[PDB]
Design a protein around this ligand. Structure first.
Ligand SMILES: Nc1ccn([C@H]2C[C@H](O)[C@@H](COP(=O)(O)OP(=O)(O)OP(=O)(O)O)O2)c(=O)n1
Ligand SMILES: [Ca+2]
Ligand SMILES: [Ca+2]
Ligand SMILES: [Ca+2]
Length: 341
DNA sequence: GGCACTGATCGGG
DNA sequence: GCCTCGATCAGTGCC
């Protein structure tokens, strides 16, 4: 088919600029402050003026300040970005009945029934860009190609404030030339399991015999890569259904005292029910992040919905199970809810 | 043998 | 750091 992928530019930082245009041209850094002490936490994202100098998503706020001590550091206002995002997604709904909202700032549209060729798709992407800038003053990047994967690769290639088509010949080109590490779904861990098999371009997956592949990276990832390499990857645009909702907070200090952990757990439950809104979950998981940043979790499913009160008692029992079965101290604690009615 | 669960892992935003 | 974060894996109960 023809797939049009849309990815909002430096999204959180850009929303802050739209709400305060005085920020334009200055380096802006959106931060997630944990609360342990002044400037503990991580950068969620930064605009290009800050990113130019190495201030990127994930780094410690303290490291960012080392690099650009005079930048504007703003606390993440996720609920604001979520509202702006919801409005832009509503705009995209008008350009295709088949839309897949992939995350807070990305969506795929199947525009097969809306255009005959790539020339026409390109024009449709420009139209969408202009509509989003018109209504919300947000810039975005558009990628277009024959499937979801190469559409995303296109947008990657053209950001910021871009638009690009990857046509059939170029798809055949990329299967040959593009490094596997640049293929969506290959991370550091799988990339280096591939290097260690010698695989470094997509075409190579087709000459290695399946089980050396499957054996090392898994059945699913092997099939995925092979289908891309055969130019046979087809995955429809499907509406996404939220499968879980939760909240995990950082404690003021590592601990494995139940009475000390409890107040953070109950706050996580409270904030989680607020986010659930009308969704009633049948499953609850307590989730612990250990001092060495590992993640442990224990859950229970009920043949019925979980009332806040049942969430409160069950969560303590689940936290207790985690304390027995793992002796590392806990750094972050929260819950996730799922299996909605 | 293979389906339905579970917690851990991996890739990603 | 936190997720309006989900998919897939190995280990297992089960038919
Ligand atoms: N480790 C990360 C990565 C991303 N985000 C959030 C903030 C980003 O703005 C948003 C979108 O991700 P991109 O990965 O799309 O980030 P920008 O949109 O920030 O980057 P770009 O303009 O390159 O797309 O998700 C986050 O909180 N933590
Ligand atoms: Ca994105
Ligand atoms: Ca983006
Ligand atoms: Ca990559």
């Amino acid at each position: 088919m023809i797939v049009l992928f849309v990815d909002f530019d430096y999204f959180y930082a850009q929303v802050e600029e739209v709400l305060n245009p005085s920020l334009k041209g200055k380096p802006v850094v959106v931060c997630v402050f944990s609360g342990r002490f002044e400037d503990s936490g991580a950068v969620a994202t930064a605009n290009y003026e800050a990113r130019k100098f190495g201030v990127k998503a994930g780094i410690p706020i303290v490291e960012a300040k080392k690099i650009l001590p005079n930048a504007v550091y703003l606390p993440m206002r996720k609920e604001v970005y979520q509202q702006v995002s919801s409005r832009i997604m509503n705009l995209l709904r008008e350009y295709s009945e088949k839309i897949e909202i992939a995350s807070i700032d990305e969506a795929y549209l199947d525009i097969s029934d809306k255009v005959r060729d790539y020339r026409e798709a390109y024009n449709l992407g420009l139209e969408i860009k202009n509509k989003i800038l018109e209504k919300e003053k947000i810039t975005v990047t558009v990628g277009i190609s024959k499937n979801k994967v190469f559409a995303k690769i296109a947008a990657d290639m053209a950001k910021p404030n871009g638009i690009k088509v990857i046509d059939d010949e170029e798809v055949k080109r990329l299967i040959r030339e593009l490094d596997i590490a640049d293929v969506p779904g290959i991370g550091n861990i799988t990339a280096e399991k591939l290097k260690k098999l010698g695989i470094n371009k997509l075409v190579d997956t087709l000459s290695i015999e399946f089980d050396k592949l499957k054996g090392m990276i898994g059945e699913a990832k092997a099939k995925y890569l092979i289908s891309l390499a055969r130019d046979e990857y087809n995955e429809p645009i499907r509406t996404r259904v939220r499968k879980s909702i939760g909240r995990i907070v950082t404690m003021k200090r590592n601990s494995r005292n139940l009475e000390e952990i409890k107040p953070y757990l109950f706050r996580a439950i409270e904030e989680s029910y607020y986010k659930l809104d009308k969704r009633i979950p049948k499953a609850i998981h307590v989730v612990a992040v250990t001092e060495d940043l590992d993640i442990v979790s224990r859950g229970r499913t009920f043949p019925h919905g979980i009332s806040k009160e049942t969430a409160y008692s069950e969560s303590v029992k689940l936290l207790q199970k985690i304390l027995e079965e793992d002796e590392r101290k806990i750094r972050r604690i929260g819950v996730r809810f799922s299996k909605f009615i």
